[PDB]
Design a protein around this ligand. Structure first.
Ligand code: IHP
Ligand code: MG
Length: 354
């Protein structure tokens, strides 16, 4: 197997994790299981704690910073760790029993169970014009040394790392998302009928989207060209609320539809951060520099669910538009963008770009 690890500035403490991206379904959220490597001597009476903070921050770009003008803690989990507290139990995973057996007796576990209805790692990077500042929800994991819970943590024998809560939806049976609209122009009842659909409801980053477009032109006019697009919507709903709208895929085609005839065709679009990096105003599931970052996924939410608490709500839509020679006639279908998915330690730091 493969495990990521990071040590405190003074290599006296070291965290070990088997993933840096935890996949949350709807039912459950993959458990966050790891272990710390301690120096019992180096710390007399001092202890080892590990906590999991989940918070929304606005201003600078990473929670652990001193330039953000707003912050709301959405979750906190503290754990007693070096001094094994019989109180604070666990069964123990098996990347653990394994790990502990390769690190020794100074190896200590910890486990976090992230509630299911918490927002997932989403980051929105405002661009050049946009008057808003950066913001996002991050999951900080920290293991530090101290006597009491309260003494003062020091950026030295302490370690922090951002993990990620990524959303996975399985794709059900259901009907393909459809949309249609009829249009009658001035001086005539002859209609121009538009109707589109997507091959499915759920897609994953990198996965192509097929759009079945059908056009029934009873009109005496002509459809010059057709434009297909995929747009993202990001609603920052906490400190300073605002709504960002941004196209992540377009595909205009000079397809013609003559008077009194029926048209038909299948278009293929691919929303991607790569062909959008540049762009800014959109929501991502991480930082840009970080390779391994995608477009923010669709914020799932429920009945009687608190929207503000989610931080940034993200959604996608496919828009079909006919330019009729005007008032183009158009429809839009909504879809859900989701996430896919001998030891030998490896750094934790996320791989970079170019
Ligand atoms: O479909 P297009 O020919 O590409 O025009 C669209 C678009 O909508 P249209 O179908 O509606 O006229 C927007 O109008 P709405 O979708 O909001 O109704 C508009 O967005 P805003 O006017 O809300 O800003 C956006 O411009 P932008 O990307 O600056 O938001 C612009 O996009 P296109 O040139 O990029 O495709
Ligand atoms: Mg599926």
């Amino acid at each position: 197997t493969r495990v990521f690890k990071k040590a405190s500035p003074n290599g006296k403490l070291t965290v070990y994790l088997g993933k840096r991206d935890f996949v949350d379904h709807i039912d459950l959220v993959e458990p966050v299981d790891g272990v710390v490597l301690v120096d019992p001597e180096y710390l007399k009476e001092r202890r080892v704690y590990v906590t999991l903070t989940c918070a929304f921050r606005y201003g600078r770009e990473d929670l652990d910073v001193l330039g953000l003008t707003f912050r709301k803690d959405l979750f906190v989990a503290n754990v007693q760790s070096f001094p094994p507290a019989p109180e604070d139990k666990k069964p123990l995973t098996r990347l653990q029993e394994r790990l502990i057996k390769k690190l020794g007796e100074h190896a200590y576990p910890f486990t976090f169970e992230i509630p299911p209805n918490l927002p997932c790692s989403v980051t929105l990077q405002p661009g050049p014009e946009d008057t808003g500042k950066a913001c996002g929800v991050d999951y900080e994991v920290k293991a530090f040394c101290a006597e009491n819970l309260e003494e003062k943590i020091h950026k030295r024998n302490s370690v922090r790392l951002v993990i990620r809560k990524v959303q996975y939806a399985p794709e059900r049976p259901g009907p393909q998302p459809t949309a249609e609209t009829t249009r009658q122009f001035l001086m005539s009842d002859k209609p121009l009928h538009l109707e589109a659909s997507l091959d499915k409801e759920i897609y994953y980053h990198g996965e192509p989207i097929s759009v079945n477009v059908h056009v029934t032109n009873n009109t005496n006019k002509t459809v010059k060209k057709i434009k297909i697009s995929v747009r993202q919507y990001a609603d920052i709903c906490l400190f300073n609320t605002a709504q960002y709208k941004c196209p992540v895929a377009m595909e205009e085609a000079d397809d013609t539809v003559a008077p009194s005839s029926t048209f038909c065709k299948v278009y293929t679009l691919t929303p991607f951060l790569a062909n959008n990096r540049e762009k800014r105003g959109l929501a991502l599931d991480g930082k840009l520099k970080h390779e391994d970052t995608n477009l923010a996924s669709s914020t799932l939410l429920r009945e009687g669910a608190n929207r503000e608490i989610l931080g940034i709500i993200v959604s996608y839509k496919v828009k079909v538009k006919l330019v009729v020679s005007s008032s183009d006639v158009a429809v839009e279908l909504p879809f859900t963008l989701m996430h896919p998915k001998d030891i030998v330690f490896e750094d934790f730091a996320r791989q970079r770009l170019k």
